[PDB]
Design a protein around this ligand. Sequence first.
Ligand SMILES: NC(=O)c1ccc(-c2nc(-c3ccccn3)c(-c3ccc4c(c3)OCO4)[nH]2)cc1
Length: 295
Amino acid sequence: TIARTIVLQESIGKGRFGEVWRGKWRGEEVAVKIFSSREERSWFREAEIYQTVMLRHENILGFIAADNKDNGTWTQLWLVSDYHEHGSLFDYLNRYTVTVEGMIKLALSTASGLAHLHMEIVGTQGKPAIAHRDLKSKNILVKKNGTCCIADLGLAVRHDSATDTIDIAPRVGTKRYMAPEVLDDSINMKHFESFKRADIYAMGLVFWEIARRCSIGGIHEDYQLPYYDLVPSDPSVEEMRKVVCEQKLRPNIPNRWQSCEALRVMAKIMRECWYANGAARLTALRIKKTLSQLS
Ligand SMILES: NC(=O)c1ccc(-c2nc(-c3ccccn3)c(-c3ccc4c(c3)OCO4)[nH]2)cc1
């Protein structure tokens, strides 16, 4: 009664695996991600993460269902979610500039989603702490109300806090957004907090992307991906490692950002997400608090 009743209308892009469509379910727009039979492990793992108890949150993509659909020749494996017409934060930031208010809304909601992912909720209906492992502007979506929600949870890892163990055996993710310790393979992958810290580094890069598009008095920067000035469009681990680990460079913080308090606060958050030492980085909770006070 899920897949059977949905009609696909428009192809809207690709996932890591799977094809994303705009579909209609009981007259409503939904997003459908479709995987083939040979991608069952990917589909199942993403279904599993989205079905985590107590996961739902305004800043996490709203999951509707996992399902199968047999068309008479082959079986499709479906994930169905809320639909957000703006699409990704990447798309949004390319299309638009934002106000100071708009920037803070995007950054705060992103941090709130990540803080929720990262947080263990204790109790009978307890939520394990979860780290994303591939956070970037392309997998954060922008809702009609101008807030963000986090998607693409297929690479996520979940923590059992009593044993300090992780639910799968984990260099995944997008090379451009990989933390220094991921790039140089020094990350201790038996340590769950290390994955949280790596997510924070990537969120700092996303905040830089947003801040570039904050237009004050007609003044703003063009849209760029982090490290656009230092690496090729599809960089290798080695190309990223030489920049981030060896030369110790980070995205440049424009001078015009010091002239505005909101932009100063954002720039300071970025610096404190970009430390080479993960243990020194801000937590998502702390970032949320700081942006909430700013909002
Ligand atoms: N570049 C990446 O690594 C990447 C980027 C994006 C995805 C992705 N997944 C979905 C999605 C997920 C579950 C169910 C439906 N769609 C969606 C999705 C969900 C809702 C949407 C959408 C895309 O566009 C309009 O509303 N995007 C996956 C991987």
